[PDB]
Structures are given as structure tokens and as C-alpha cells.
Design a protein around this ligand. Structure first.
Ligand SMILES: Nc1nc(N)nc(-c2cc(Cl)ccc2O)n1
Length: 294
């Protein structure tokens, strides 16, 4: 629109491109996300519009939802850096454990809030976690899959990230629960610690098998009902579980314990965001300021 002075294209999301823009009249700098374009479910605009009510320190504020020329634009408060960029910038030294701990605590607070309001993210990844100079971290792009439905790609020949997808999704479950966000966050937690993606699959089956090779091929003992899932194949190789100590070295036992609960196969056994906040790992949590190069 002509209401802005578009600073630059910010990035490509699963549901659309994001832009940094300034209001010509108010001068406020915001993030503008453009969704796909033959109509779009109107029941979805209602659901998305409801998200404007969400207010929490760890959720990026949704300022406006605009429907024009059959396009959907989401106007969000702007943050200067995403966690993927920050992790890449911190690859030589690594993110200090106290900062990793602070970020995980805040993200769980954000998820606990959304989940208590029956809002799921469903596509959590480093790219949609944003940080500022004051040590805060916030989740952006909640509830798009629930309102619109996860399509095939972003909008134009894009390589979707499968790395943070929960096993029940990869196995074809039709109904998702808030547990899918805890899984994604667990994967991100591991990544901040080791400075390498935990399950970097290059295909849906490679994604699934990388999880199996690490946590062990699931069975009815650890995950009742798994052999009945839509995409389950009795022909899946049976890999034995690896020690966690090999998974995220050199994370201490409190951290490893918490991560293992975030990565349980059974969505029912997987820890909730609220319960995770009470885990001993957070007994000494603080709020460090990051070294951000903007
Ligand atoms: N990649 C990237 N980088 C920056 N600096 N900001 C964003 C961003 C994305 C959304 Cl959806 C909402 C607000 C934002 O600030 N995304």
C-alpha cells in the first residue's frame, strides 16, 4: 500500500513474505507480512483478527489485519533480529548458557500464554522468534495453520523447514495439540546449545528417520497408538535410542532432563509449557542482555 515507505524485504515465511516498513503519516516502523490469492477463507480473517487481542510480553504484537485486493496483510510490531540470524552470529562463541536459559524461559511463558488461550503456533522455528536489545524474545506468527491450514509451500517455490516438526505431524496425524509447539521449542533449545540443528532432515522421511536414529524408533510401549498412525509403516527400521548426553553436550543434567521431557514421542507424555516453567533448570534463571550487532 501507499501508506508506507517500505524499508526492505525482511524474509520469506511459510505463510508469506515479511517486510520492514514505516508509516508515512505516523512514522512508526512495523513489520508487514503479506499472505496469499483468489479469495482466502473469510472464516480465517475472523480467527486471525481475534489474535489482535493477544497481549503478552513474549508474543509479537499483531497491530492490524488488512484485507485488500484479495490479499491479506498482517501488521506487526517490529523487532530488529530473528533468532536464526543471532545464532549464526553467535556460532564461533556460542550463546552464553544464561542467555539461552533466559530465552527458553521467556518462550515457554509465551507458549503457556497462547496455549491457555487455545492458540497454537504449529510452525515454530528460529526464524519466527524475534529478539531486541533489552534481552526479550518474542514469538511471531501464531495461529496461521489453524485458521488457514498448512498448505504445500510458502507461496512460490520455497523450501519449507521440516527440522522442527513434531513426530505426530510427520506420521500423518490429522489433529494436532499444543504438544507440537513444545517439540519445536525443544529442537530450538538443543540448537542454541550445540550450535547445530538437532534434526536437519532433507525430506519428510529423512526428517522422521533422523528423529528415530536419535530417540529410537517408537513403539507401542513408549507411544501407545503409534503403529496405527496414518503414515506409520511396519517396515520402518528399528533404531535403538542414543544417550541424551551424546545429544546435547555439554548441557548439564537439569537441561538434558528438561529437553528429554520436551521431546517425548507421545504428545500425551510431552511436557506442557506451564509444567516446563517449573522445571529445576529454571531455578537460577536471569535476564541477561545480548550483544546485538544491528
Ligand atoms: N526475519 C525477521 N527479521 C526481523 N527483524 N523481524 C522479523 C519480524 C517478523 C514478523 Cl512475522 C513480525 C515482526 C518482525 O520483526 N522477521
Amino acid at each position: 500500500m501507499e501508506n508506507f515507505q517500505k524499508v526492505e524485504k525482511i524474509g520469506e515465511g511459510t505463510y508469506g513474505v515479511v517486510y520492514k516498513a514505516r508509516n508515512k503519516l505516523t512514522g512508526e516502523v512495523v513489520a508487514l507480512k503479506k499472505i496469499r490469492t483468489e479469495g482466502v477463507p473469510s472464516t480465517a480473517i475472523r480467527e486471525i483478527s481475534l489474535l489482535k487481542e493477544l497481549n503478552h510480553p513474549n508474543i509479537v504484537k499483531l497491530l492490524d489485519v488488512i484485507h485488500t485486493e484479495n490479499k491479506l496483510y498482517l501488521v506487526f510490531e517490529f523487532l530488529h533480529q530473528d533468532l536464526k540470524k543471532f545464532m549464526d552470529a553467535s556460532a564461533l562463541t556460542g550463546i552464553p548458557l544464561p542467555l539461552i536459559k533466559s530465552y527458553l524461559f521467556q518462550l515457554l511463558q509465551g507458549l503457556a500464554f497462547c496455549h491457555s488461550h487455545r492458540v497454537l503456533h504449529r510452525d515454530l522455528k528460529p526464524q519466527n522468534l524475534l529478539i531486541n536489545t533489552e534481552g526479550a524474545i518474542k514469538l511471531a506468527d501464531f495461529g496461521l495453520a489453524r485458521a488457514f491450514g498448512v498448505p504445500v509451500r510458502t507461496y512460490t517455490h520455497e523450501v519449507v523447514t521440516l527440522w522442527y516438526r513434531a513426530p505426530e505431524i510427520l506420521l500423518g496425524c490429522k489433529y494436532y495439540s499444543t504438544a507440537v509447539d513444545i517439540w519445536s521449542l525443544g529442537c530450538i533449545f538443543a540448537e542454541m546449545v550445540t550450535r547445530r540443528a538437532l534434526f536437519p532432515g532433507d525430506s519428510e522421511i529423512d526428517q522422521l528417520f533422523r528423529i528415530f536414529r536419535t530417540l529410537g524408533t517408537p513403539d507401542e510401549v513408549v507411544w501407545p497408538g503409534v503403529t496405527s498412525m496414518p503414515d506409520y509403516k511396519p517396515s520402518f527400521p528399528k533404531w535403538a535410542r542414543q544417550d541424551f548426553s551424546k545429544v546435547v553436550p555439554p548441557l548439564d543434567e537439569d537441561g538434558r532432563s528438561l529437553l528429554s521431557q520436551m521431546l517425548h514421542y507421545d504428545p500425551n507424555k510431552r511436557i506442557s509449557a506451564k509444567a516446563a516453567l517449573a522445571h529445576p533448570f529454571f531455578q537460577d534463571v536471569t535476564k541477561p542482555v545480548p550483544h546485538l550487532r544491528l
